[PDB]
Amino acid sequence: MASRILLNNGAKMPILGLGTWKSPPGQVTEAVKVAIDVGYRHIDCAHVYQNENEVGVAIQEKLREQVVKREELFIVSKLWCTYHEKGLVKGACQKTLSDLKLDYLDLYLIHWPTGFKPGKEFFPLDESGNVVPSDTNILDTWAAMEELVDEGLVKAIGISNFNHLQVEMILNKPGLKYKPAVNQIECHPYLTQEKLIQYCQSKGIVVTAYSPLGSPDRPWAKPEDPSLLEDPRIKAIAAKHNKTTAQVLIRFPMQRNLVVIPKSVTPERIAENFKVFDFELSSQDMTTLLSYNRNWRVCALLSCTSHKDYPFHEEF
Ligand SMILES: NC(=O)c1ccc[n+]([C@@H]2O[C@H](COP(=O)([O-])OP(=O)(O)OC[C@H]3O[C@@H](n4cnc5c(N)ncnc54)[C@H](OP(=O)(O)O)[C@@H]3O)[C@@H](O)[C@H]2O)c1
Ligand SMILES: O=C(O)Cn1ccc(=O)n(Cc2ccc(Cl)c([N+](=O)[O-])c2)c1=O
C-alpha cells in the first residue's frame, strides 16, 4: 500500500486526506495542525466551506515550524457553483489562494456540475424553493479551468459530482487541453459506486471518495436515514482487526485504489483516522463491504433537482 497515487498531470496525490467541510473556523486551525503532525499531507478544502483562511493559518504555522515544506503538501480546493462563468473563474481561484495563503493549488475541482446565479449568496433560491441557475455550461467552465493550469495557479484540475456522461462530455470536447485528473464523488459501503469508479479509473481519472463515514454531521440528514458508523456488520469487521469502525471505513476505499478524505475536527479522531496503514482488510472483508451497497446517497439536494446539469438523474 503505497501512500500516494499517480495523477495524469505527472504529480503524486496522497491517498488519505483530511476533509474540512463543517469544521468551523474557530476549531479548524487546530485540526489541520494536528493532521499535518500525524502524517496527513492532503487536505480537502473548498471556498463554500468558508474556513479556508483558518486551514491556511495551520499550513503557514507548519511551514514556519519546519514540520513540512509546501511541496510535500497536496492542497485541493474547489470552484463554487456561483463562479462558473469563464470571467469569474480566475478571481474565484485567486480568492481561494489568498485565503489558503498559497502560491498555487495542487488540484482545483469544479465542485458541482451545476452553475448557480452569480452573486453573494452561495445557494440563491427562488419562490419555488429551487436554486437559481446560471447561463453556464460544463465545457466552457472547463476551458476556464484549463487556463488556470496554463497560468500556473493550479497544478491539476478535476471535477466533483460528475456523472459518467458529464465526464465523457469533457473527454470528447473539441480542443480539449487537459483531461480531468480526479472525479471526487460520494462513496461508502451504502453507495459503493462500482460503475462510476470502473468508468473513471478506465479513463485514468483518479477517484476520491467523499463522505466515507456517511457524513453523520451533514445538516439535512433525515431521522429516517442510515448510520454507517453504527452498522454492527462493519463493527464486526473492525473488531476482528482490533480497529474502529471508522478505520475500516477509511481503509476500504484505500484498497479499491481510491483516495479518501474523512473529516474530523477532533484531535483524537484525526489521529485515529490516520492509523490505517498497519492493517489490511481481507479480500473477504472487501467483498463483504461491497455487498452492503444500497445505492443510498446522502449528498444531494431537492432544491437542485431541476437544474439542467443535476448529476444524479443518471444511473451513474
Ligand atoms: N465534493 C463534494 O461535493 C463533497 C461533498 C461532501 C464531502 N466532501 C468532502 O469529504 C469530506 C468528508 O465527508 P463528510 O465531511 O461529509 O463526512 P465523513 O468524513 O463521512 O464524516 C465526518 C463525521 O464523522 C465523524 N468522525 C470522524 N472520524 C470519526 C471517528 N474516528 N469516530 C467517530 N466519528 C468520527 C466526524 O466528527 P468530528 O468532526 O466531530 O470528530 C464527523 O461528524 C468533507 O469534509 C469534504 O472535505 C466533498
Ligand atoms: O458541496 C460540498 O462539498 C458539501 N455540501 C455542502 C452544502 C450542500 O448543500 N451540499 C449538497 C449539494 C450542494 C450542491 C449541489 Cl449542486 C447539490 N446537488 O444535489 O446537486 C448538493 C453539499 O454536498
For residues 264 and 35, the answer to whether their CB atoms sit within 8 Å is no
Q: Is the distance from CB of 83 to CB of 92 less than 8 angstroms? A: yes
Cα distances (Å, whole numbers) of residue 151 to 88, 235, 294: 15, 48, 43
Q: How far is CA 126 from the centre of its chain?
A: 28
Resolution (A): 1.0
Task: Determine if residue 240 is labeled as part of a ligand binding site.
Answer: yes
- Mutate which of 20, 21, 166, 234 for ligand 1 pocket (most atoms within 8 A of beta carbon): 21
What distance, in Å, lies between the first and last C-alpha atoms of the chain?
A: 28
Which runs of E-coded beta strand occur in the chain? 4-6, 12-14, 17-19, 42-44, 74-79, 107-110, 157-160, 182-186, 206-210, 259-260
Atom in ligand 1 nearest the alpha carbon of residue 273: 31
Q: Is 204 left (phi over 0), alpha (psi -120 to 50) or beta?
A: left
153 is in an annotated binding site: no
How many angstroms does the Cα of residue 120 sit away from the middle of ligand 2? Answer: 17
Q: Whose CA is nearest to atom 3 of ligand 2?
A: 21
Q: Which atom of ligand 1 is nearest to the CA of 18?
A: 47
> Does the annotation place 14 within a ligand binding site?
yes
CATH superfamily placement of domain 1-316: NADP-dependent oxidoreductase domain (3.20.20.100)
The residue contributing the CA closest to ligand 2 atom 10 is 299
- Identify the DSSP state of 76: E
Q: Which ligand is nearest to the CA of 19?
A: 1
Say whether 96 sits in a helix, a strand or coil.
helix
Phi, psi of 59 (to 5 degrees): -60, -50
Can you name the residues that pair with 127 across neighbouring β-strands?
Answer: none
Cell of 81: 457553483
SS3 62: helix
Packing angle of the helix pair 283-290, 245-254 (nearest 10 deg): 100
Q: Give the residue, by CA position, lying nearest to ligand 1 atom 13.
A: 211
CA distances 259 to 12, 15, 216, 254, Å, are 11, 4, 20, 6
Task: Please tell me the experimental approach by which this structure was elucidated.
Answer: X-ray
Taking alpha carbons only, the member of 133, 125, 157 closest to residue 82 is 133
Sheet arrangement for strand 107-110? 17-19, 42-44, 74-79, 107-110, 157-160, 182-186, 206-210, 259-260
Tell me how far CA of residue 105 lies from CA of 72, 194, 232, 234, in angstroms.
Answer: 12, 29, 40, 36
Residues with CB under 6 A from ligand 1: 19-22, 44, 111, 160-161, 184, 210-218, 229, 244, 246, 261-266, 269, 272-273, 299
Beta-bridge partner residues of 43: 18, 75
Identify the DSSP state of 224: T
Task: Report the distance separating Cα 290 and Cα 108, nearest Å.
Answer: 30
Torsion sign, CA atoms 237, 240, 246, 249: negative
Contact 93, 147 (CB under 8 A): no
Q: How far is CA 150 from CA 143, 145, 181, 203, in A?
A: 11, 9, 15, 22
Task: Look at residues 194, 183, 7 and name the one whose alpha carbon lies nearest to residue 112.
Answer: 183
Domain coordinates in residue numbering, the chain: 1-316
* Those residues with Cβ within 8 angstroms of residue 66's Cβ, 6 or more apart along the chain or in another chain: none
Q: How far apart are CA 27 and CA 218, in angstroms?
A: 17
- Counting atoms of ligand 2 from 1, which one is nearest the CA of 81? 16
What is the position in ligand 2's atom list of the atom closest to the CA of 113? 16
Size of the chain in residues? 316
The conformation of residue 191, written as its DSSP 8-state character, comes to: B
CB-based pocket (< 6 A), ligand 2: 21, 46, 48, 81, 111-112, 114, 299-301, 304, 310
- When computed from its CA atoms, the radius of gyration of the chain, rounded to whole angstroms, is 19
Q: Residues 291, 230: contact at Cβ < 8 Å? A: no
CA distance linking residue 287 with residue 281, whole number of Å? 10
CA distances from 93 to 118, 180, 271 (A): 15, 17, 30
Has 118 been labeled as part of a binding site?
no
Backbone phi, psi, residue 191, to 5°: -145, 80
- For a mutational test of ligand 2's pocket, the pick from 301, 303, 312, i.e. the residue with the most ligand atoms closer than 8 A to its C-beta, is 301
Give the 3-state secondary structure of residue 156: coil
